[PDB]
Paper text:
Here, we report three crystal structures of the PKA catalytic domain (PKAc) in complex with three peptide variants of PLN, WT, R9C, and A11E.
Therefore, to distinguish whether A11E mutation forms contact with PKA or not, we solved the structure of PKAc in complex with the A11E PLN peptide at 2.8 Å resolution. This complex confirms that the mutant PLN can still bind PKAc but with fewer interactions, which explains the decrease in affinity. A11E forces the NTR to move away from PKAc without affecting the structure at the catalytic center. PLN A11E exhibits an approximately twofold elevated KD value, relative to WT PLN. For the structures of PKAc in complex with the two mutant PLNs (R9C and A11E), the positions of the substrates near the PKA catalytic center are relatively conserved, which explains why their turnover numbers are nearly unchanged relative to WT PLN.
Residue numbers in the entry:
A (entry chain A): 18 to 350
B (entry chain B): 11 to 19
């Protein structure tokens, strides 16, 4: 499949879809999550009744905060990728004030919500999710793409219990090393913190932080102010909970490696060093890709458009100025 | 505890 996936990505990358719908065709039901440049809300298509998740971004704040190329890459890359664990973009448009990205609604909620309400996942439960992340990272790296925001708040469980990755806000074609300081402080790799110039190896570091937080219930490095979290990330020492496996401690010691000349995924053997680790000995990678494994946890679905698995946010009406702002900056959107 | 927001600077 990876052989045919490269041509399809480049086909959708150069001939992207733009302006496929408008705001008047969508009823707005409930907010699913609030970011820094906008919000995501559950949305119902009036003519077809189908439900969707609409990510709204204010154009002025994006231009003001130097985020133009980041948002341009978000829409273009997500529109061009196709993998059984990536969220699918369905519509995209814009008006005088906002940009709109309409994705497929994932009613199961964030993995962060279920992680906090349960405490932690057992090792086989956490291994079942990491296998999907490993397969997705192998796919995205085949296309020379980077995903610089792996965290449970960006991972949604679906109705089959499988992971759907969202939030492509920092995704970028990286043919070599990039330099942008971005991500989530708990999951930043040391080379990002020190402005050293990083490659695809940062995704594997973020995978080690994720496997840690799932199997323990808390991240390996956290503190009040983010400055102290950076101090713990670059220190090189990481302490493990006592109930952790020897097989899991070994894998995390290779993923949470500061020296990226000895970090798994960045070595000569690539993703095979991870998939062939002892901790993944009981993992049928083909069955996970084909989604033929009974999920350990399946969220409750009270019907279509059910928002139970999401938190309640302060609802705010969507309002557009009567003056178009930053029209020339978002031509390619 | 609280949804960690991504950083840009
Ligand atoms: N397709 C979707 N289906 C269901 N819920 C979704 C979907 N996309 C996003 N959400 C929810 O809405 C939230 C918005 O997240 P996100 O897309 O990361 O916006 P953001 O501005 O990038 N936040 P951040 O991670 O700090 O950059 C997510 O954390 C999910 O809870
Ligand atoms: Mg997010
Ligand atoms: Mg984001």
């Amino acid at each position: 499949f990876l052989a045919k996936a490269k041509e399809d990505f480049l086909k959708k990358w150069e001939t992207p879809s733009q302006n496929t719908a408008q705001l008047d065709q969508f009823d707005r039901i409930k907010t699913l999550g609030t970011g820094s440049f906008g919000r995501v809300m559950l949305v119902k298509h009036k003519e077809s009744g189908n439900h969707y998740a609409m990510k709204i971004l204010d154009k002025q704040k994006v231009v003001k905060l130097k985020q133009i190329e980041h948002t341009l890459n978000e829409k273009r890359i997500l529109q061009a990728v196709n993998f059984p664990f990536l969220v699918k973009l369905e519509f995209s448009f814009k008006d005088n004030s906002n940009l709109y990205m309409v994705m497929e609604y994932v009613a199961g909620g964030e993995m962060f919500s279920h992680l906090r309400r349960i405490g932690r996942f057992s090792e086989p439960h956490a291994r079942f999710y990491a296998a999907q992340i490993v397969l997705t990272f192998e796919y995205l790296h085949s296309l020379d793409l980077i995903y610089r925001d792996l965290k449970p708040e960006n991972l949604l469980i679906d109705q089959q219990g499988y992971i759907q990755v969202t939030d492509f806000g920092f995704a970028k074609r990286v043919k070599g090393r990039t330099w942008t300081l971005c991500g989530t402080p708990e999951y930043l790799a040391p080379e990002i913190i020190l402005s050293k110039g990083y490659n695809k190896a940062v995704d594997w570091w973020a995978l080690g932080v994720l496997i840690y937080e799932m199997a323990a219930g808390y991240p390996p490095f956290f503190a009040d102010q983010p400055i102290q979290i950076y101090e713990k990330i670059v220190s090189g020492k990481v302490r493990f909970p006592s109930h952790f496996s020897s097989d899991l401690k070994d894998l995390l010691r290779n993923l949470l490696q500061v020296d990226l000349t000895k970090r798994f995924g960045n070595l000569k053997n690539g993703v095979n060093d991870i998939k062939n680790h002892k901790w993944f000995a009981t993992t049928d990678w083909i069955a996970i890709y084909q989604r033929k494994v009974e999920a350990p946890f399946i969220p409750k679905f009270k019907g279509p458009g059910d928002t139970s698995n999401f938190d309640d946010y302060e609802e705010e009406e969507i309002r557009v100025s009567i003056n178009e702002k930053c029209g020339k900056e978002f031509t390619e959107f | 505890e609280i949804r960690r927001a991504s950083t840009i600077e």
